[PDB]
Paper text:
Rifamycins, an important component of modern TB therapy, target the Mtb RNA polymerase (RNAP), the enzyme responsible for all transcription in the bacterium. In bacteria, transcription initiation occurs when the ∼400 kDa RNAP catalytic core enzyme (E, subunit composition α2ββ′ω) associates with the promoter specificity subunit, σA, to create the holoenzyme (EσA), which directs the enzyme to promoter DNA sites through sequence-specific recognition of the −35 and −10 promoter elements by σA domains 4 (σA4) and 2 (σA2), respectively. Initial EσA/promoter DNA recognition triggers a series of events as the enzyme unwinds 12–14 bp of DNA to form the transcriptionally competent open promoter complex (RPo)34. Recent mechanistic studies have revealed that mycobacteria RNAP exhibits unexpected differences in basic and regulated functions from those of Eco and Thermus.
Here, we present a 3.2 Å-resolution crystal structure of a full Msm RPo containing [name]/EσA and promoter DNA containing a complete transcription bubble and a 4-mer RNA hybridized to the DNA template strand (t-strand) in the RNAP active site. We formed a complete RPo by combining Msm [name]/EσA with a duplex promoter DNA scaffold (−37 to +13 with respect to the transcription start site at +1) but with a non-complementary transcription bubble generated by altering the sequence of the t-strand DNA from −11 to +2 plus an RNA primer complementary to the t-strand DNA from +1 to −3, yielding a 4 bp RNA/DNA hybrid. The Msm [name]/RPo crystallized in the same space group (P21) with very similar unit cell parameters as the us-fork complex and diffraction data were collected to a resolution of 3.2 Å. The RPo structure was solved by molecular replacement and refined. There were no significant conformational differences between the two structures, which superimposed with a root-mean-square deviation (r.m.s.d.) of 0.59 Å over 2,933 α-carbons. The W-dyad forms a ‘chair’-like structure, with W287 serving as the back of the chair, and W288 as the seat, buttressing the T−12(nt) from the major groove side. The methyl group of the T−12(nt) base approaches the face of the W288 side chain at a nearly orthogonal angle, forming a favourable methyl-π interaction. The guanidino group of R290 (absolutely conserved among Group 1 σ’s) forms a cation-π interaction with the downstream face of W287, sandwiching the W287 indole side chain between the exposed T−12(nt) base with an inter-ring angle of ∼27°. R268 reaches across from the σA2 region 2.2 α-helix to make salt bridges with the −13 nt and −14 nt phosphates, positioning the R268 hydrophobic alkyl chain to interact with the underside of the W288 side chain (opposite the methyl-π interaction with the T-12(nt) base;Fig. 1c). Very weak and broken electron density for the αCTD was also observed in the Msm RPo structure, indicating very low occupancy.
Residue numbers in the entry:
A (entry chain D): 4 to 98
B (entry chain D): 879 to 906, 910 to 1010
C (entry chain D): 294 to 586
D (entry chain D): 1123 to 1195, 1202 to 1283
E (entry chain F): 374 to 466
F (entry chain A): 51 to 150
G (entry chain C): 21 to 205, 215 to 1142
Write the structure that this text describes.
Amino acid sequence: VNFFDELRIGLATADDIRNWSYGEVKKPETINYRTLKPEKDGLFCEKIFGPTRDWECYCGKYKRVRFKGIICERCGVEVTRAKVRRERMGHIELA
Amino acid sequence: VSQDVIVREHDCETERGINVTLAERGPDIRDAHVETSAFARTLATDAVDANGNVIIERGHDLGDPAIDALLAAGITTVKVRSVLTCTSATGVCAMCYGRSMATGKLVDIGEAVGIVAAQSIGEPGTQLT
Amino acid sequence: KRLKVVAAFQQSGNSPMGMVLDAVPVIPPELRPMVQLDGGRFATSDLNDLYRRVINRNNRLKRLIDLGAPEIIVNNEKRMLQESVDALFDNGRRGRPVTGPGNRPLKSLSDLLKGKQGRFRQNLLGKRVDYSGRSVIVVGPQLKLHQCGLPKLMALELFKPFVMKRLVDLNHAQNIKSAKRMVERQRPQVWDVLEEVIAEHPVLLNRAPTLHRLGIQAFEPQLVEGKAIQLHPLVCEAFNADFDGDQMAVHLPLSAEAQAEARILMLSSNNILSPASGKPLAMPRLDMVTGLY
Amino acid sequence: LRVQGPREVQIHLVKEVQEVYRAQGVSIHDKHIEVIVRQMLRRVTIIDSGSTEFLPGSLTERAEFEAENRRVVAAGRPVLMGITKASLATDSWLSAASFQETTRVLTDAAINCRSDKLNGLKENVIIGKLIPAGTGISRYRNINVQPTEEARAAA
Amino acid sequence: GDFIEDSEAVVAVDAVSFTLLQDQLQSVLETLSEREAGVVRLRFGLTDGQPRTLDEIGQVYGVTRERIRQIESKTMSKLRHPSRSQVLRDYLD
Amino acid sequence: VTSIRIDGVLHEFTTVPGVKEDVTDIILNLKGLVVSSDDDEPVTMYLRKQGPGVVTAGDIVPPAGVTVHNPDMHIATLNDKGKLEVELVVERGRGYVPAV
Amino acid sequence: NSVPGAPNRVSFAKLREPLEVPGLLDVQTDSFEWLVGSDRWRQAAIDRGEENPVGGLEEVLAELSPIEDFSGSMSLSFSDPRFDEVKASVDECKDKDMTYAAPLFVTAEFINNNTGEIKSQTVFMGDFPMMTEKGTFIINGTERVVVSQLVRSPGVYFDETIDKSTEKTLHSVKVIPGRGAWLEFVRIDRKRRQPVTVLLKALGWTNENIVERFGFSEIMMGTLEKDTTSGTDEALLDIYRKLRPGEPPTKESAQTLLENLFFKEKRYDLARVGRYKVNKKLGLNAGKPITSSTLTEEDVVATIEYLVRLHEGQTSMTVPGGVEVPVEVDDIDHFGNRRLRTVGELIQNQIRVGLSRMERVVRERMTTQDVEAITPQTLINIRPVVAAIKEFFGTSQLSQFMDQNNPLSGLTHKRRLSALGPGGLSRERAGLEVRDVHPSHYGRMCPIETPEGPNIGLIGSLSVYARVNPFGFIETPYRKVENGVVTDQIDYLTADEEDRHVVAQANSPTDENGRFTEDRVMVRKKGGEVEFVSADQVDYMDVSPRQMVSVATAMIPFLEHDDANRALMGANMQRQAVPLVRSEAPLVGTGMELRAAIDAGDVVVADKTGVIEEVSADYITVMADDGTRQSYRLRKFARSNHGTCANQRPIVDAGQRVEAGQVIADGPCTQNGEMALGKNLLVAIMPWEGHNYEDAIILSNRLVEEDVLTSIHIEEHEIDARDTKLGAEEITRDIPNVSDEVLADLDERGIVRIGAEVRDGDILVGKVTPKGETELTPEERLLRAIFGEKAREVRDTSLKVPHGESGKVIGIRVFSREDDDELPAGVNELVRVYVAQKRKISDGDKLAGRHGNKGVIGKILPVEDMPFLPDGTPVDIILNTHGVPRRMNIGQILETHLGWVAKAGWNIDVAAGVPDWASKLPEELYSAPADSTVATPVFDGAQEGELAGLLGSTLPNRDGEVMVDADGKSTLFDGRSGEPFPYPVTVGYMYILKLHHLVDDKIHARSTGPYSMITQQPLGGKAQFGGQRFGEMECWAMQAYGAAYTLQELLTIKSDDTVGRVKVYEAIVKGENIPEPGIPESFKVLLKELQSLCLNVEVLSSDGAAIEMRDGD
DNA sequence: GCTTGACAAAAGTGTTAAATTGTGCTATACTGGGAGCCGTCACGGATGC
RNA sequence: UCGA
Ligand SMILES: [Zn+2]
Ligand SMILES: [Zn+2]
């Protein structure tokens, strides 16, 4: 749209950060050393940040654009565009 | 600091201004620099002589031909319209600023003079010691 | 001075609790990318390891708490978590920065915004643009004040999409694929087509550094042989461009509004006077002076 | 400034600034130096009162101070500040963030829950909007063009 | 970091070429039997996007999977024939 | 002369065995050739020199209707191992044309 | 001259060189020989100097010997460094991409006599990189050069400042060690707020001793009068806690801590240079054996005495029991206090770090590793040692890629002196005090030559006759003169020693027998300040002019007539020249080209007198008179490190006879043994119809037809076949999607054919990579069925020549894995293709003279229409007249007149009495043939009177007519108009160079290309095919005009708008209008970055509430 | 013009041999890191003394 | 590390 009057700043409360996040990253893992896939519950995990391939669940049950807005029951990845990986944020629950 | 300054309106209509030296104490002359100060300006209030002939009316562009006539009349001062006295709630008005230096005419309603002034001062800075 | 902060929290509705974090947001992956380049070797952003130090120390703290531990070990782990989050947001602001291999300080979220290399002065207040090029400048003493010599190879790549649609308009090529291959292969047909789109299509010339607005001026392109650029000798005073090997850049306006601003506002013939003192900036100088004198 | 008032400080600054540039043979116009000087004296200190969240020892714009001071249902003196301190006091918090001391500018804006109206041109440049100047003024860009009926008849 | 180009970034020419390629296939497939064109659309998926199979296409047109392979072969030889394929040579890749 | 051809070299940047010069330096020496041809269509001369000695401009056997006006020109110097076989294309034209 | 093959170039020098120019590569070779037991360096130290020479390796092994476990029961001793023959020839190293090194052997004895005694062994530290005969190194196949760093020598240097409190002067003292904690006067180890008198009580000094030494001139006595406590042991507890205050201090630990921190050699390492500096500077151990560790006490007692002495101003100070030495403040820039760390020493420091990094493993290993039987074989890990060497030659600022455009650039690089680097100042950290030339730079560092960028004053070139000391201080030769008579004696003086004498001027009157002819003579005192004295007080004299200027500077004719600025540009641009096809020596030039050419190493020299047996383009063979047979292989069209050609040509005839040191084959830029960096062109200086305007230049088309300015450029391309995660990469002709017509130039293997031509976009090497899953669209994969072309599992990744270049393929280099070869993990086949091209001189290419005159080519007129003499001989270059007077470089005019003088023959009448213009005239130079070469040494040159007289000369242009008058101007004829020019113009032969800055490399154009990953903006550089940066200052200019749409267009659809750029491309191709821009992608990234900092940011509409750019905002 | 049945290929599909992966454990006695840092310059304003 |  590119027509909006003002942009406001402020402080993000712990609840604001939790509402932004699509999941908690529970492990300091990036990618598998063999398959080079985004291992689950780490950084890059498709369960939260979104799929690597467009309209593809991690396990490959839903590979086509017919079904979107659904989450694979096995791999727990939502079927949508891979661009969401740019906009989707996680969070860490501190002890 | 000056990038947000642009010419918003034609005239602020205020009567305030500042004084220019314009040829002091000659002869028995003129001034070293009248082109940096008096030139390109716009007269704030009427310039009158000793007997009040009112040689040059308000708002004149104060070109070199106007300076000669002012010197012939014998007045050593003129109150000029400047951006310091300009009200113009937002930005500045074209009449207070003065003649556009590149155009040689009055300033357009769209000219952004803050960036132009910043570049005008900054560019020669390589020659200072 | 202490009141300003106390009053700031009083006027707004944000609780001061926001100054302590019970949760740390995680930046999306594509903004901290991990990708491979040559033959399998990998490259990743520094945030991933700064995050790693945070998550690793946070989980080790959970393990110490469940077992139960002397306060010496737990508190030591807690301050480690405190510095790991600090190093993530701003590295080096408190004590020594977290260093990588060879004593290189890791880039932190705050380092992304700050500095000449930050998001602002680097990727925001300035950007790298398409439809542009550069080359050396040579004197164009035979040019008109509004004209500039443009290398034919440069103009071909700059106007490539235009000449493509033109030789598709004409039957010289079928569809758009043979048009692109015909431009890339230099086949002689496109030369007559380039002069057609080049006509009365202005371009912007830039000579860095740009001190004033006259450092950028619009010209009418004239297809010229060779790889150099022909510049009008009068505009040299504006660009402060010596012919000792200076390089200049060219940009191509596209939308009708852009072309109009180049013809009216930024045309070379339109600005002959310095918009500071008022003295004419483009006037006979050097050879022309002694030539007329 | 403490003696001769605001209008004289602007005369003194332009005189001194032009004197340095004249010594090297550089000829500029006083109107330019006045454009820069005008921005230094646009703020006033608030000594007392304010009647509504106008704190003592604070620097607020004169025009905005004149509107709030009405409140017929605050006292201060004009100040003189450098261009850096003035450009850092701009009402646009991301304009000061892109200028200098990005870290300090951000923490202060977030604590005050500041809001940027996206008025100045540096803001419109960052967000990819049309700058509010030149051909970007609210008037020029809305111009409507139509052929005159007398001229259309020729076709 | 500034030297790594985005591999998945969309190229303009190929994206514009894909549209002009879609425009050309519509005209070529438009000249055919309305039932022959439907078999080719379901086979490769086209509009739907999911390539079907002979048996699935057999329930819609009410024929055996063998009868469609006959239709698929006859329409392919008609597609390979130069009047239709002379324009698509540039799109090999 | 337009183009030349040598059996042993596939390009201009290699040296021929047994000779003091290189192909580039030999071509820079061949530029000084002054030839005259009465045939519009192109024709090829031939030069073959074995054993030690100095190859000069007269060692080329001209086809029918062409001649060489400076046989004293120095081309190359070879030794016992040196052998030079080269054919050159003489053409008709005017002015200056670069390498095609 | 003085060289066997030296051609004949007459010199105008009024003096004779008493000293020959020393070996110009000695700076690199001498330091490297000192490092590794070179018997050549062993003799040098033995004949004059100590009888116990110690190599750089031997001295570091002496530091490491022995290694003890702290129990004293066992010890590990090192000794006897051993080197064997190099692993491979440098040619094979540069070819195989392997470093050029020789193995290292040593002796390590494991002794434990507490238990049963152990045994010795022979240890191998690793393959050690060795410096070549050219003074360079081969590291991983690339030719590199280790530069010489400028570091502040260890020692004591005192300064005086003006306190801000009062106008009275102050004195601060700083002792600078190499590895020490550097206490400063009395802050120690960077601990502020320190008293002066606490140290004596800290050292245990009795109170009565302070009064004796400090009683004179008050001062410290007053400082001793005011103190916290007077207790000797109490001062320990006061100072010991000040520095460390943590973990409460122990009584015994604090006593010996200062001896540990300073007196101990382990924590405080006494510098062998500083030991010499401070001992003789302060008078301690005067004329005593060296190699003393950190000063016990006496030296520190002299520092405090020197400080109080400096306040009083007493010049003569005798340390108690010591000698007397002047008391004065020191200048840091004086080359006596600033030394040059050489290549051998720089490598030594890295070996020291490698050995120190090893002992940590050995010390930790000897304790916990078995017992009694381990020996060095058990655990001695040399990985950290060799890593220190490998990590140094790369990544280090001192070790740089050899810069070689021409043999000059390579030579000047090796003698370079730069202050920046590890252990040195950063470029921003460096003040303006170092950049200014110091009076001590005379004859040592060249003041003219330096960079014009941010590096001004930091980088410099070592002088001609200078050479480095064993301690690192530069020495300069001088002719000792005693009692007003010049002597044959020559002594090398260095800084401090140079100030103790007065230096006569090299240029001075000399009688036949020899002596000071004039009554009053010039000299330069210890100021340095010029002085006019008499022969009585003169001791040393310059060996000759140009002692200061370096090689590149000394190669500029008429250097004294040009300003230092343009002279710096002329010297820098000389190393920026390029080898031409036929390089011809300069018509007029100083005699430095001869010597500098043979010392660069890029030419061929004969090392034995004899007769040539065979001559060929590939190699030359010489038969020595002693019976031996030597051969020299000629580098043929080798690609230089920067892309130029190194082709060499033989200058000798088969049956000729050579001599030791005589030239054989010329180098890339050379002619018959001299440095040829350019061509001699006929130049008329006049403005020509605006085509040469403001430094622009115009060329004669003859230069293009005759190739005089043509150069060759070779380029190297490389690609590898690696094992991938999904399979193996295959190099072949099988590229999946291509027309068979485009692969016609490939052989079966899939590479390009040698000798074939190419162009931007062609396939040099075809390759392939697997992909999966394929996942083809519905539309595509329909054509696969009709056209029956099976979609290949592999994806096409090939090697294609980039945009804007072409040429012929010179050669190929392929390393297969099937063939053993050598390859890193994952790679199978490695292929390199070498493409070259003949570059004609084109419009826009940069030409420059030797005086700093530079400019591009504005146009090239055909030979028909060009200003030409009455000869009918057209000129070559037309130089703009307006540029000569302003730039303050008039030497170009002098060499232009002299260039014409030397071109045509010239004969002096001389009559019977000779012209007086020739009283001090050149000797026996009166005559000279046509096209004669002449030499004009810098400060002994051809003077003004001679030039005028030289203009009168023989000018037989095919006939009797002379084409140049005595004023050097000729009447030119316009070839375009047909009428003569109205006035006489200056014509002559100048010497111009072709510079590596070429239009073909610099031209760049882009419409759409690769985009950055994080931000969608394009990239930079031509290699990446990137776009131009539209920066902050350029946006200001765009806003000053007031054009909003042009600015928004550049910052949205031109760059960061993901959906806008493809739509704009779609609109242009379809002929539609350009659509409306979107939001720059970098702004969305900016919001996400702010959200990571925990700043809640929202973009909200004027009405209602906030909106979302995407899933989140 | 379409269908049949037999028919081979392919595509899953469930089940088992296998590799990969994670956690625990080792009992002479051993208990507080080592690394380092020299060459701005000018300024403002807190913070610390 | 160099070019304006
Ligand atoms: Zn799934
Ligand atoms: Zn006004």
